[PDB]
Enzyme design. Sequence first.
Site, PDB file in Angstrom:
ATOM      1  N   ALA A  71     -74.083   3.703 -60.532  1.00  0.00           N
ATOM      2  CA  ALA A  71     -74.092   5.077 -59.998  1.00  0.00           C
ATOM      3  C   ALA A  71     -75.086   5.942 -60.698  1.00  0.00           C
ATOM      4  CB  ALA A  71     -72.773   5.713 -60.061  1.00  0.00           C
ATOM      5  N   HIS A  96     -78.395   7.532 -59.371  1.00  0.00           N
ATOM      6  CA  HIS A  96     -78.539   8.699 -58.536  1.00  0.00           C
ATOM      7  C   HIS A  96     -78.271   9.987 -59.310  1.00  0.00           C
ATOM      8  CE1 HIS A  96     -78.212   5.327 -55.771  1.00  0.00           C
ATOM      9  NE2 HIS A  96     -77.031   5.081 -56.314  1.00  0.00           N
ATOM     10  N   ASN A 106     -79.613  -2.529 -63.704  1.00  0.00           N
ATOM     11  CA  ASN A 106     -78.846  -2.057 -62.574  1.00  0.00           C
ATOM     12  C   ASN A 106     -78.010  -0.919 -63.152  1.00  0.00           C
ATOM     13  OD1 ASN A 106     -77.127  -1.375 -60.506  1.00  0.00           O
ATOM     14  ND2 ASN A 106     -76.565  -3.464 -59.809  1.00  0.00           N
ATOM     15  N   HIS A 157     -80.630  -3.334 -57.627  1.00  0.00           N
ATOM     16  CA  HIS A 157     -79.376  -3.046 -56.890  1.00  0.00           C
ATOM     17  C   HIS A 157     -78.930  -4.290 -56.207  1.00  0.00           C
ATOM     18  CE1 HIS A 157     -79.732   1.164 -57.606  1.00  0.00           C
ATOM     19  NE2 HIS A 157     -80.973   1.115 -57.163  1.00  0.00           N
ATOM     20  N   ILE A 158     -77.735  -4.782 -56.523  1.00  0.00           N
ATOM     21  CA  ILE A 158     -77.240  -5.991 -55.890  1.00  0.00           C
ATOM     22  C   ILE A 158     -77.210  -5.927 -54.336  1.00  0.00           C
ATOM     23  CG2 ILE A 158     -75.249  -7.524 -55.719  1.00  0.00           C
ATOM     24  CD1 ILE A 158     -74.771  -6.809 -58.676  1.00  0.00           C
ATOM     25  N   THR A 159     -76.831  -4.769 -53.784  1.00  0.00           N
ATOM     26  CA  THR A 159     -76.761  -4.628 -52.323  1.00  0.00           C
ATOM     27  C   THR A 159     -77.830  -3.643 -51.851  1.00  0.00           C
ATOM     28  OG1 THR A 159     -75.112  -2.879 -52.498  1.00  0.00           O
ATOM     29  CG2 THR A 159     -74.277  -5.143 -52.131  1.00  0.00           C
ATOM     30  N   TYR A 180     -68.723  -9.213 -53.215  1.00  0.00           N
ATOM     31  CA  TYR A 180     -67.500  -9.779 -52.606  1.00  0.00           C
ATOM     32  C   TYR A 180     -67.155 -11.374 -52.854  1.00  0.00           C
ATOM     33  CZ  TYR A 180     -64.282 -11.509 -49.094  1.00  0.00           C
ATOM     34  OH  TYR A 180     -63.303 -12.227 -48.457  1.00  0.00           O
ATOM     35  N   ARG A 203     -76.562   2.558 -47.232  1.00  0.00           N
ATOM     36  CA  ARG A 203     -75.371   3.272 -47.633  1.00  0.00           C
ATOM     37  C   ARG A 203     -75.543   4.779 -47.454  1.00  0.00           C
ATOM     38  NH1 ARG A 203     -73.807   1.009 -53.467  1.00  0.00           N
ATOM     39  NH2 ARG A 203     -71.620   1.521 -53.088  1.00  0.00           N
ATOM     40  N   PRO A 221     -72.205   1.731 -64.953  1.00  0.00           N
ATOM     41  CA  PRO A 221     -70.767   1.918 -64.686  1.00  0.00           C
ATOM     42  C   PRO A 221     -70.263   1.077 -63.537  1.00  0.00           C
ATOM     43  CG  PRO A 221     -72.045   3.933 -64.116  1.00  0.00           C
ATOM     44  CD  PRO A 221     -73.017   2.950 -64.734  1.00  0.00           C
ATOM     45  N   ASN A 222     -69.058   0.588 -63.693  1.00  0.00           N
ATOM     46  CA  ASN A 222     -68.384  -0.142 -62.633  1.00  0.00           C
ATOM     47  C   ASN A 222     -68.866  -1.558 -62.417  1.00  0.00           C
ATOM     48  OD1 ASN A 222     -66.684   2.222 -61.924  1.00  0.00           O
ATOM     49  ND2 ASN A 222     -68.658   3.008 -61.212  1.00  0.00           N
ATOM     50  N   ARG A 269     -77.511   7.987 -51.684  1.00  0.00           N
ATOM     51  CA  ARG A 269     -77.793   6.829 -52.529  1.00  0.00           C
ATOM     52  C   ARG A 269     -79.197   6.353 -52.324  1.00  0.00           C
ATOM     53  NH1 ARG A 269     -72.895   4.550 -54.734  1.00  0.00           N
ATOM     54  NH2 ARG A 269     -71.200   5.307 -53.451  1.00  0.00           N
ATOM     55  N   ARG A 313     -62.977  -7.480 -55.904  1.00  0.00           N
ATOM     56  CA  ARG A 313     -62.333  -6.908 -54.704  1.00  0.00           C
ATOM     57  C   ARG A 313     -62.306  -7.784 -53.404  1.00  0.00           C
ATOM     58  NH1 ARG A 313     -64.509  -2.705 -51.646  1.00  0.00           N
ATOM     59  NH2 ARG A 313     -65.427  -1.721 -53.505  1.00  0.00           N
ATOM     60  N   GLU A 347     -85.687  -1.684 -61.764  1.00  0.00           N
ATOM     61  CA  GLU A 347     -84.437  -1.170 -61.222  1.00  0.00           C
ATOM     62  C   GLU A 347     -83.901  -2.208 -60.264  1.00  0.00           C
ATOM     63  OE1 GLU A 347     -85.024   2.231 -58.404  1.00  0.00           O
ATOM     64  OE2 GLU A 347     -83.021   2.892 -58.885  1.00  0.00           O
ATOM     65  N   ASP A 391     -85.195   9.501 -68.897  1.00  0.00           N
ATOM     66  CA  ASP A 391     -85.916  10.024 -70.028  1.00  0.00           C
ATOM     67  C   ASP A 391     -85.899   9.107 -71.277  1.00  0.00           C
ATOM     68  OD1 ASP A 391     -86.971  12.136 -68.708  1.00  0.00           O
ATOM     69  OD2 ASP A 391     -85.637  13.683 -69.564  1.00  0.00           O
TER      70      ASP A 391
END
Lengths: 144, 144, 144, 143, 143, 143, 144, 143, 145, 143, 145, 147
Positions: free
Chosen positions: C77, C80, C74, C100-102, C20, C107, C11-12, C111, C19, C98, C87
């Site tokens: 959200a 978490h 990735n 994660h870009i950042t 880097y 954070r 998601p997202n 997280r 918005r 897994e 599963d």
Amino acid sequence: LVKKVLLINGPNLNLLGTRYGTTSLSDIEQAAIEQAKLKNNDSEVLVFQSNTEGFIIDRIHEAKRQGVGFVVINAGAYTHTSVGIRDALLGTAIPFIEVHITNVHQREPFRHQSYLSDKAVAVICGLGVYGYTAAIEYALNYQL
Amino acid sequence: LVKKVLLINGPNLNLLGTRYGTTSLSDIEQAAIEQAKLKNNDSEVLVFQSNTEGFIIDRIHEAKRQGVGFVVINAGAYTHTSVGIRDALLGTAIPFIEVHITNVHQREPFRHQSYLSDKAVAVICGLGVYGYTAAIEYALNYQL
Amino acid sequence: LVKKVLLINGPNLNLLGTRYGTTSLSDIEQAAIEQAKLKNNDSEVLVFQSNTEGFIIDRIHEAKRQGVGFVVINAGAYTHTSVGIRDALLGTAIPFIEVHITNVHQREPFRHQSYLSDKAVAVICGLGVYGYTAAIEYALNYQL
Amino acid sequence: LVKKVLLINGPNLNLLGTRYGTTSLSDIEQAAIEQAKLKNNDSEVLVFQSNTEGFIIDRIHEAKRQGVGFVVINAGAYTHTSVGIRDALLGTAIPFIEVHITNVHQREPFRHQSYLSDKAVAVICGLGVYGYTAAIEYALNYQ
Amino acid sequence: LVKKVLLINGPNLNLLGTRYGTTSLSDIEQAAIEQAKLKNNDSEVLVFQSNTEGFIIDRIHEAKRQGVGFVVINAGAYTHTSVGIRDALLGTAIPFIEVHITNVHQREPFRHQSYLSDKAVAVICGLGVYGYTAAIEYALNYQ
Amino acid sequence: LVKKVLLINGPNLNLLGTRYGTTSLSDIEQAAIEQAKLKNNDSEVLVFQSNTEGFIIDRIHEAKRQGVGFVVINAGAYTHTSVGIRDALLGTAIPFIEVHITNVHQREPFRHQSYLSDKAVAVICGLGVYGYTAAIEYALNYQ
Amino acid sequence: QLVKKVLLINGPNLNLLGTRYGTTSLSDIEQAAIEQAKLKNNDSEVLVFQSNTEGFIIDRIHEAKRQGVGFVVINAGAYTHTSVGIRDALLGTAIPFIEVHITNVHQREPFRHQSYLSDKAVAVICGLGVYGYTAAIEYALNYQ
Amino acid sequence: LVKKVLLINGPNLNLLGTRYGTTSLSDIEQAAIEQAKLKNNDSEVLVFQSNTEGFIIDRIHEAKRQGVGFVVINAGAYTHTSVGIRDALLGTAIPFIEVHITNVHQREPFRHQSYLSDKAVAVICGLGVYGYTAAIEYALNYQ
Amino acid sequence: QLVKKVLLINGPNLNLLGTRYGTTSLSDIEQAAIEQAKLKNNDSEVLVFQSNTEGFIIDRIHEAKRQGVGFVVINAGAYTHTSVGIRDALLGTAIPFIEVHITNVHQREPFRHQSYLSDKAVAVICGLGVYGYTAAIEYALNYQL
Amino acid sequence: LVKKVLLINGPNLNLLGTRYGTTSLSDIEQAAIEQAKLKNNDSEVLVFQSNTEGFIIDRIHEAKRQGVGFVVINAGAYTHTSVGIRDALLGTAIPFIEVHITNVHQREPFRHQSYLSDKAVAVICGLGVYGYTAAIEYALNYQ
Amino acid sequence: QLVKKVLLINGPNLNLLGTRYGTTSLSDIEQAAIEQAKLKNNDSEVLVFQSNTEGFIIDRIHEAKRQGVGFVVINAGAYTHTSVGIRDALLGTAIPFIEVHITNVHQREPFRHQSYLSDKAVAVICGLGVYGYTAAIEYALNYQL
Amino acid sequence: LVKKVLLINGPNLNLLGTREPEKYGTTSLSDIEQAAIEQAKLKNNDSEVLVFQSNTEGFIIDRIHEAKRQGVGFVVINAGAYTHTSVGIRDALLGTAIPFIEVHITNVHQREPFRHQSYLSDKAVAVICGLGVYGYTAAIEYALNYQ
């Protein structure tokens, strides 16, 4: 339907806003008083602020004697610390709405616990001083 | 000031009140649509409800793509569980208010944690249906 | 030696980078495809993104029926909150990484929990978009 | 663009892989010295390993006197116990990547806390030895 | 006496048993349907499975609209994460039983938390597929 | 059977018993040396004490090169704090017993955690100095 | 090849059902179970035990092993939350077992949510009322 | 009342303040020496600094041996990790004051727990470099 | 002077070693202990006890006081983790004790890390197998009364 | 530099030491008044003590109105319980130092939480009454 | 109307007061209580029990119900902290009860601060010494059925 | 024996009679006070119970100090809410070294977890809780008999 509402502000709330817009305690209180005056059916908003826990409890006892039918309260710091205020509101059996000007959930986790939330009719937070206005509309609409 | 608010109700909210006042989801959405119209001035409230997390994220992306400048959201169960919705709001940068018709602090402790609360402008809870109304007033006076 | 690799973003992710730096989701996908083509031995990377949990679960199911040997994910959200995604990976038995870009460890405390990490072959996290590239190099050299 | 990288390995790392594939610490270091060599432009990877916490702190101090611009560290056990190593990297202000050969999230809950991760630029783990190559590519490309 | 029972299977359950017997979701769905036929008294078991949370909620809603009087649910992964399904069951007010084919208590401590158990009528876990039959027998006797 | 045992003592233990009887570190070390010598079968106890974590890890590494076949260790404060020692014992694969002279569970909560106990063959604690003797008997009888 | 000899054990207080919610007694449950087995034409058997004393329940499990019991269906009552000694005796005699609860313990005080049997039980049935035992006996009589 | 005082500084303190004003470790060590010289009554302040836990424990042991009566200590990172230092000051029975230049309660909540506070005579913290001066005045005045 | 009379208590389920991991029985252990004292040849004695019932072990500890027992070596088995009452019996008769666990309990489920004995025992041996008992008995037989 | 400093003492503090060395609250208050006169530049130290939380809050608001520049406060019990005092100091934006006469970390775990520490400029605790003198010296030197 | 038949229960180890901190014994407390009812002169009665075995205290509670005991005053000793079984027996038979401790548990180890009786008890008196039992019986003997 | 006993009741207790009567009963604070006073009178040896109630934490602390000055030798206290929040009361009781007993009219253990913590319990001589108003009488018997 409620005609007598008591606004309470706790410690430090006399200091808004001497430090973030010039909106003072005096303003909030006035606007509340006038809110009710303007329904023109003898609603009244009584007002009190103090920095002493016991005094706020005293005022809540007084309120019952006075036929106060609802409380809008911003207990400031005392939200996180005062079982005594909770026991007062329970004790005299006056329904209440908990107000915080800012979003407490944005701050130190100790501030996320409240001794009032779980017994309030409602909890408004982060709606600014408007949050007092919304609580008071609710209050003036609530069946005795 | 904001001209375009989007109202999101989450899972189960379509079910009110089928079971405690016969006030429907349909009513809430309507009252809000009206609320903006009656402001006379090109304000508008768009409405959405899904049972599905993904679809609510989808709607939030959609809302930015169409210049929505504020969200009033009752995420229902998803408040307690959806990190994805939090990041959708954060990632699109739309300010929001969390609504809860009832007072969650009265309920089971799992419902005390929200993934929206600490990033919202405000959180109103227990003010009944009226809580959507006050979120919307605030939204419509928020500067861009 | 793995031929069919599936890159999934959650998601997202569709939203970078509005918005880097102007590095879009689309870019990452393309780079990942070219990585596998540029290997000359009929390796391949399929790409997927969704905001819906269920959809990511479905895509992992077909990925099995389609004989995918490895997954680079990735989950955004859903890292978490999604025991379903976890599963699905276990259930189809596809090894995974897994991404994660950042650096999630910088954070909010929530997280730091993942439902993928203890089952992932590796966790790359904060290496920027190059995170994907290293995951894929690793994927492509892993034994079926 | 960074030119002087230091690879640090902490305690016990000297002993790969005496017990899972013949890959020694010495290999990882050599591969890393040579990785920079190949960049062809006056990059350099310095290498270090110790079992002593104070010594790793001492090293990080001298790294800064030496003008190291980036660190790639595998602190071994010290990942989970060493506030001092965290403070050394912070106190000298050298950016860093944290590497673990295997995937610590697979192991005991105590190993899920790091005193590095939240101050690290990145954290790679479970990528095997490739984890180091990857960190270095990254390092050699940074501000 | 309850006539209309809905069996809901959650995410990943479609995948049994591809990998631990030869028993598929399709089989379990079919046993359950026959089980109510065999009773003779126009009982009925309707089946559902879905990987999507929102869709299982959508279904529970439909289930009320349909007069379904009991739900036997194996929510899979969603047992541990889905408050939405809990609130759908409470919100439609359809009594329910939680099934787990395997014994969740034998697994990762996160799988011991459920958003269903404290509101279920019963929880059956580790009785294998028969776990479903028991839950249907009980279903078909509820008032 | 084991013939070569290493006795390690951690920080501060050079200071027994200067403060609850007069027994000094070198007494304990003497006794262990002879306990093994008096087996009369070319057993051997080596001894070591240090206040530095790093050096205790170094020593456990040398002990492997040395063919040491079991370790009897009292790590003093390092019990509560040193994953590095833990990982040196595990990494060299030497079996070990953890010894505290005084009953640690009688003390502050923090001293109840140990990074050695779940990996040790045994933990004797509070059995006074004799704890070292029982550990060495045990050691000297292991495969 | 399937199990013949089965032990039904009930823990403290269970003698008292149901003398306070409906007249189904402990003897009822015990007799139903005995008759469940005889009704199989095939020499299965259910042995029955109840005790308020922990030690005695542990003694009974040792005895069960001497007797060649292949399966225990146990309702440890209160001891479910407090008896490591019982858990260790089942483990100790390596007899498999299903843990039964008549009512749904998850509905009750959080201390009742933890068991020293569940993670070593074959299954946990709880809240199926009395049929709980019946289903545990079916399963049991079908086991390897 | 106390004549001989040992000021200890832990890891990283050598770095003050290269990076937030120009007060160096050396400035502090000096001022403390000078402080006790000016009493003219034969007081003295010895000074030590190290990055290695073990070495500070060694130093604490020697200080006992040379009749040091009080210890003023800023342990840096080691406050939060070193049970070994605690046990050294306890084992040599020398009273002590914990100093922090900056206010530790302002930082990461891990820096809130300390293995010294609860056994220290006093904990001064955030009073800047004067923290050391007052610890020493107190020290020099103590039975 | 020195402790001449020692009670060995074994708690629940320990009658079952080793029926399931070497053939060393509960009785082997109790015999060995009995023999340990006899062999100091000076009128020391080890008395042996085992039960599965918490109450009975508490009872036995009370008797032990009446009998003049001056030290207990105890393997409470599962009662180690659950039994405040055993702890208070040992406290209340004020007999000093050693906790013994045959296997290393720290290697097992987290709940077995907690003990209601460890903080009041003179020592806790655990993981030293059956020799655990022999060692606790040497210590006990040397303890000052 | 600061000219006007407020000494606040919280509940029970007027009872020293009526039970541990004859040093009364008055004594401490005078010492503090005196410390500032002897700086000979019209620094001034104001003093206040109350057993009522509200009233200490009142005092801090009043201090702002009076242009108090810094607060040295020993809130006694109120340290562990009063978000109100903290918010009064935050509200008026007067920098402060927290004093405890005794070393609070030696006492019950609850006395380890302060609602002042993370906002104070420093926290002195356990220097006994000199604690106030140090806090005031510091105060009078704050820019 | 008012409670006539009260049961006094004392749990493990209480038989050992006060053998070590004043000479008051279990028997003393028992006798005191038996007489307290006698003096009311209205056919009130205190029955008394002590056991170290949990199951036996559970059995005694059942027997009490069968006897028409209408209140229990119980000092469970250590079982307060560990016995859901006892709690479930008093709930099970629905006899109202009062939890007594001779000494103030809140002054002691933190585990002793949790009880399985307190939240179900009518009251909990602790630290009021042996008088604690007397206060509990006065109250019992005035409690409405 | 002790002669002067001081009964302190904390916030909200003045509402006994009206306050949450399902939980607290319908006997007023005044009756509890009068009953206490007379308890001492009847011991006939110049014992005396003095009474005090306040909604203010600070005032209760002040009163406890005043009590050492007046030679009060024992405190029977229902701190109300302040049991769960007032470290300051605890310090006042400790600072004057007066022995005390903590009284709860209701059984706090049946109520919200917050109410299970007290800042008096671990330093009190005894805690009597749930014995309703008799609670007070029994704490007062205990005081009047104390060394």
